[PDB]
Amino acid sequence: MSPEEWTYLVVLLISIPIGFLFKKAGPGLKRWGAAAVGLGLTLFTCGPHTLHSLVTILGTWALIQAQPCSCHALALAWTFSYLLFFRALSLLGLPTPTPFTNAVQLLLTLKLVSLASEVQDLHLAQRKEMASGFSKGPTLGLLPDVPSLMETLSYSYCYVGIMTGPFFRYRTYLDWLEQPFPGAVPSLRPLLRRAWPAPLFGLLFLLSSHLFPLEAVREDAFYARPLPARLFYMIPVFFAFRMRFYVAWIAAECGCIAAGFGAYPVAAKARAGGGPTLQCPPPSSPEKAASLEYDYETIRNIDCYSTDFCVRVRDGMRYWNMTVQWWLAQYIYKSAPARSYVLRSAWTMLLSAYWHGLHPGYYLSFLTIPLCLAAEGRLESALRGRLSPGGQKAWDWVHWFLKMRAYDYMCMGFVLLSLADTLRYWASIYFCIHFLALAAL
C-alpha cells in the first residue's frame, strides 16, 4: 500500500461528490468549474511537472492550425516522440516525474490524438462539402466547429478521466456540456447498480495481496519451493492484479456516472467508448427525458463477468479496457500500413506496449501474447467443429481453465517489470505455457 497509490485512491473516491455537485451546474459554469478542478488537482498531485502536459496540448493545437490537412499523422508522431522525450528525463538529467505524471501523460496522449483525428475528419468533411456543392445534414459524431485554444484547455483538464480515465472522445465532452435538463438523467440508481461489488472486490484484493505478496518471487528462497508450490502461487498474483484494476476502474466509472458524463439514450445503441452509433432526438421536456431509459456504457471500461469467465483469449482481451481498446482499434489498427492480420496485430501490440512504458517487461509480455493468440486461432478453427455437444462443454471448461492460466502466466512477466527476474521466474516454471502453445500451434 504505497502512499502514491493511496493518494490515487483518495482522489478517485473524492471524484464522486464533485460529480454530484457539478451535475446540476449549467453548461458554461460546469465547463469552467470542471476545468478549474482538473487543473487544481493536476497541480496538487503533479507539482511543477504540469509543464510537460501544457507543452503537449500547445503543440497539438499549433499542429492543428499549422497543417489542418495532415494534422492526424503529424500530431500522432509529435505526441509519440514527446512521450519518448518525457520518459528519458533521467537519460538527460532532468528531474524525474511521479507516476501520476506518467498516467496523466498517457491519458492526454490518447485524448489529443483523438481530437486531432476529429479535426482532420471534420476538415476533410468541409472540403468535400464545398467540393460537391451539396451541403449534407448534421452527421452524428462530427464536431460542429474547430475548437479554440481555451476550449481545448477546458476539455483536456476535465476532472473526469484525467488521472485514471477512462478515455472519452471530445464529442462526448460536447454532448455532456450541451445535455439539456441535467436533473432528469438518473445518477444514484446506476451508481448503486455498479458500486455494489466495489467493497467486496477491494476486500478480495487486499486478501490476496496480504496472503501472497508479489515481492516473494524477487527473493531467491521462493524458488527452492517445489514446482507445485509455484503453480499454486502463480494464480493469486494475477488474481490480485485483476482485482485491483477492477476496483480502480469500477470506482472510476462510478465517479464518472456521478457527474452524468457519458449518459446517452438506450435507443442510440451506443458503443463502449465509441459513443452513439444511431442518432436519437434530444428530449423536448424534462418529463419526457425522465421517461426515457439511460445507460452509461460509453464510459464503461471493463466488464467483470465477461473477462473473468470468458472462453477465448481474443474475446477476453476485447472486453479488457474497452475504451482504450476502441481507441487503438480505430486510430492504429485501421491506419496500420500492413495488410496481414498477424502483422497488424503485432503493430497494435507494439504500440500498446510503447504506450504502457519503455520497460522490457511490457515488450516481452506483448510479444509473447501473439504466439498463444495464433495457436488458439489455429487450434479452435481446426478442432471445434469435430467435437460433440458434451465434448463442446468439456472443451469450453478446459479452455476457460487454460485461458485463465495463460493470463496468470503472462501476468507475472508483465508485473515483475525487470528483465532478469522475469526471465528467472519464467525459466523456473520451465516455459510450461510456451511449450504447450507451440504444441497447440
Residue numbers in the entry: 1 to 441
Copy the relevant paper text.
Membrane-bound O-acyltransferase (MBOAT) 7 acylates lyso-phosphatidylinositol (lyso-PI) with arachidonyl-CoA. To adjust membrane properties according to need and to store specific fatty acids as precursors for bioactive lipids, cells remodel the phospholipid acyl chains in enzymatic reactions known as the Lands cycle. MBOAT7 mutations cause brain developmental disorders, and reduced expression is linked to fatty liver disease. Here, we report the structure and a model for the catalytic mechanism of human MBOAT7.
We used single-particle cryo-EM to obtain a density map of MBOAT7 at an overall resolution of ~3.7 Å, allowing us to build a model of the entire protein except the C-terminal region (442–472), which was not visible and presumably disordered. MBOAT7 comprises 11 transmembrane (TM) helical segments, connected by short intervening helices (IH) and loops. TM8, containing the putative catalytic His356 residue, resides in the cavity between the two TM bundles. A tunnel twists through MBOAT7, connecting the cytoplasmic and the ER lumenal sides of the enzyme, with the active site located in the middle of this tunnel. In MBOAT7, the lateral opening of the tunnel has an extended channel that branches off to the lumenal leaflet of the ER membrane. Compared with other MBOAT structures, our cryo-EM structure of MBOAT7 is distinct, inasmuch as TM6 is divided into two short helices linked by two evolutionarily conserved proline residues that are not found in MBOATs 1, 2, or 5.
